Amino acid sequence: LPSESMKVVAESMGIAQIQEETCQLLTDEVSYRIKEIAQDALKFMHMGKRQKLTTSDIDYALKLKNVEPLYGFHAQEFIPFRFASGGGRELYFYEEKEVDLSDIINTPLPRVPLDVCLKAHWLSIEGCQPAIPENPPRLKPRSIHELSVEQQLYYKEITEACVGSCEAKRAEALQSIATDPGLYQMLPRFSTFISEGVRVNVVQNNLALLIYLMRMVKALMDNPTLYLEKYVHELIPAVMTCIVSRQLCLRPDVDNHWALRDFAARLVAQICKHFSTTTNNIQSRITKTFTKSWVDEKTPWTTRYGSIAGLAELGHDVIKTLILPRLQQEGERIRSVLDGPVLSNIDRIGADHVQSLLLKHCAPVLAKLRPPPDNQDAYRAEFGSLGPLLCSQVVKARAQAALQ
């Protein structure tokens, strides 16, 4: 240790005018005791099998050398505090050095973790390591398929379970897709089965077939082992067909189930704009297609509603800028559906869903950039769509923020 730190300590104690040989005598004695303890604290690190040298190793190394692990305070009577340590304090250099005494009481205590349990698994089966989640990772000859019989038994069973005849079968197959480590090298056949399926499954609008395939896409995405952006190109079209294309079945009823699938599709669309991102290829391409779907005139109100759902779930900055200028076209479309008597078509249902989603999204956008003053009739400057009900939604958001 440096001697110019030892003279600062001495003159801040009342011992002034110390010589350099007196001061060098202090810094070779205490630097030995640090070296004697750190060599002795490495014994507790090597028998604790942790190669870490935690803060408690010096507490036992001090107690071994008959020195109290007491730090920052030394009791000359020893009777109140013996060789038991006080685990020091939580330290940071960047601390505040003054807290309020009711701030420490009102904070929630951390969760005591689970107790130690003994689980057994298999490192090796007769020499081979299994791929379980407890483990880390002139005629030309007649060729063999690159899948094993069993690798494809998995496939045929997983695909026949993922078409959702039974719900428990689906859910396991979806978890199996979500965490099989060896599901690479089968992934072309899964991507082709998804893509091909949606395209011949929108010829007749079979909603379950589509809701099961979208859940299969979601189960493919959250698997951490497999490399997906080689099959990224098929991802944008397959989800988009369910969310914005017309429904060949019944638009008015099954639309609620269609909407659960719609939410799944917007979540996958956000994943596409969250993962797999490079410069100006994926997110901007789907944003441009969504906007020219919106600026589209007399679009299938199913498509229009789907395009609105796609443009709505894109995040914080997207929605505010995109909706701002449109504050009139949406209202005019709603007014046309209202005036024309035609009720047996799906136009009225599409209009109500679009207006509710646009209004609900507007409330955070308004709650996010501006105070909640004049929430009664100022929204009549924005054609009076949501008005006081929009203000009530903003108030509910403020209450949720207060709860947080």
Binding site: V202, E229, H233, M240, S245, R246, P300
Partner: peptide, 25 residues
């Protein structure tokens, strides 16, 4: 950097916007 493998993956180079079927007729 324009020779990076991703540039050549066909998600970043293709018309999958047409593959989206609106009103299958």
């Amino acid at each position: 950097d324009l020779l990076a493998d991703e540039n050549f993956l066909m998600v970043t180079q293709l018309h999958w916007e047409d593959d989206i079927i609106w009103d299958g007729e």
